[PDB]
């Protein structure tokens, strides 16, 4: 089944790209923390699952596009289109194997990644908040970020739109056999959605809005933008 095949190749490259990002950023933090402060062997898993929660969907973009392009260069996607695949392979394959990989990142950030930084906080005691649930927000309403963490909770679909029209640009390319010259433009033209979507948030409040549809409009407009 092409579902489990394209899931196999994207999962095997997506572990690679996630490792390549988070093991890099771990030593990014390691070099200046052991530059200034400090002592031997805790700093790596000091900050892993919150770095997973941060760098997951960008790694999803990069790995899904790069692996699907390396598969795509050898004409497999054009012959599976020739047999009769459509946007359905996108819809029920790459989504179907990528958003179950973001459900457990939501699980890691709801279940243990706040404790994943609590362990770092109470291990700070030898030296010298954008991660929460509804249990503070509805009293913050009486006390802004009124639905900003609500939008933070709502991201299996923002990553879906993030990835979807991005790899719609790699669903096509057919000038000769175009050889990955434009997967960089695909990740480029898809990268600006964090530039727009998170910053459309502060634009909602200035003229009066319900922030539910204030968050659901920029995520779903780009869902509707490129349904080829």
């Amino acid at each position: 089944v092409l579902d489990r095949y394209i899931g196999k190749t994207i999962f095997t490259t997506i572990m690679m790209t996630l490792f390549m990002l988070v093991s890099l950023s771990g030593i990014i933090k390691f070099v200046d923390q052991l530059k200034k402060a400090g002592g031997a062997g805790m700093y790596t898993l000091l900050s892993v699952p919150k770095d997973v929660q941060i760098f997951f969907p960008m790694a999803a973009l990069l790995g899904a596009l790069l692996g699907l392009g390396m598969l795509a260069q050898r004409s497999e996607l054009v012959v599976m289109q020739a047999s009769g695949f459509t946007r359905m392979q996108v819809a029920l394959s790459v989504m179907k194997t990528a958003i179950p990989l973001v459900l457990l990142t939501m699980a890691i950030g709801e279940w243990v990644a706040p404790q994943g930084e609590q362990m770092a906080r109470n291990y700070r005691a030898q030296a010298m908040p954008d991660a929460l649930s509804i249990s503070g927000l509805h009293n913050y309403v009486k006390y802004r970020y009124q639905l900003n963490m609500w939008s933070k909770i709502f991201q299996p679909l923002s990553v879906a739109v993030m990835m979807l029209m991005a790899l719609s640009f790699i669903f096509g390319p057919l000038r000769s056999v175009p050889m990955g010259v434009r997967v960089v433009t695909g990740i480029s033209f898809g990268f600006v959605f964090y530039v727009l979507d998170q910053i459309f948030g502060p634009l909602t409040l200035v003229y009066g809005i319900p922030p539910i549809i204030g968050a659901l409009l920029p995520s779903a407009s780009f869902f509707l933008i490129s349904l080829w």
Binding site: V1, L2, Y5, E76, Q81, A82, G84, L174
Partner: protein
């Protein structure tokens, strides 16, 4: 059914390659598209199936103009395509490829799917490589399973480019029998090849293309009689 193109054209960087190419195929018909190197066959196939943006022409199924509609909905309308360069899946096995293509067939259950897959592997004689991984086959079995995964979708019309590339002649005559038996089923096929002395034995009529100019068409005896194309393409 009938697929017809009318005065196709395609170019890039000024160097035009296709001018006024037209073609006509009915349901249950074996038409051929021979021609010299760089004649325009695969680009004509690209304009038929909707790989490249066409500059002029009319792709129509005699009543529905699909000429600005892309490839996936064209294949859902029922054309079949085979790539010139090899395009098998490169981690699967052979039965994995065939059954995975046959999952899209929305007319029969999975026991008839594996039945049809067993029929196709028996009928191409690849059962003694049926569980080898895909990317490491040889060229003969690779082109043979290309033709298998192409024929497995059962379209109305089917387009091939060099189906005889790197194939031993016994399997060539085998594939000849398979395509003519599907002609007995009544399914129109379009073929481009270079082994002319095995291509002409199966084809009914044959368009001949030379640098956009559809310079000849007719029966095998007339296109062999043509001293023009014997100078241009046969030798």
């Amino acid at each position: 059914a009938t697929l017809t193109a009318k005065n196709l054209a395609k170019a890039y960087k000024g160097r035009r390659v296709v001018e006024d190419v037209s073609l006509t195929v009915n349901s249950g018909e074996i038409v051929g598209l021979l021609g010299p190197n760089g004649a325009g066959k695969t680009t004509t196939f690209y304009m038929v199936v909707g790989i490249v943006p066409r500059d002029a022409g009319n792709i129509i199924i005699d009543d529905d103009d699909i000429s600005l509609l892309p490839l996936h909905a064209r294949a859902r309308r029922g054309i079949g395509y085979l790539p010139q360069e090899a395009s098998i899946f490169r981690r699967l096995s052979v039965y994995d490829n065939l059954m995975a293509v046959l999952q899209i067939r929305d007319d029969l259950s999975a026991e008839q799917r594996e039945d049809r897959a067993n029929e196709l592997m028996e009928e191409f004689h690849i059962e003694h490589l049926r569980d080898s991984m895909g990317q490491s086959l040889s060229g003969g079995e690779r082109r043979r399973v290309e033709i298998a995964r192409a024929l497995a979708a059962n379209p109305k019309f089917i387009l091939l480019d060099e189906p005889f590339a790197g194939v031993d002649p016994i399997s060539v005559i085998d594939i000849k029998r398979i395509i003519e038996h599907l002609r007995d089923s009544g399914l129109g096929v379009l073929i481009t090849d270079h082994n002319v002395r095995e291509t002409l034995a199966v084809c009914e009529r044959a368009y001949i293309v030379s640098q956009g100019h559809l310079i000849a068409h007719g029966t095998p005896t007339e296109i062999l009689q043509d001293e023009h194309v014997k100078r241009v393409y046969l030798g």
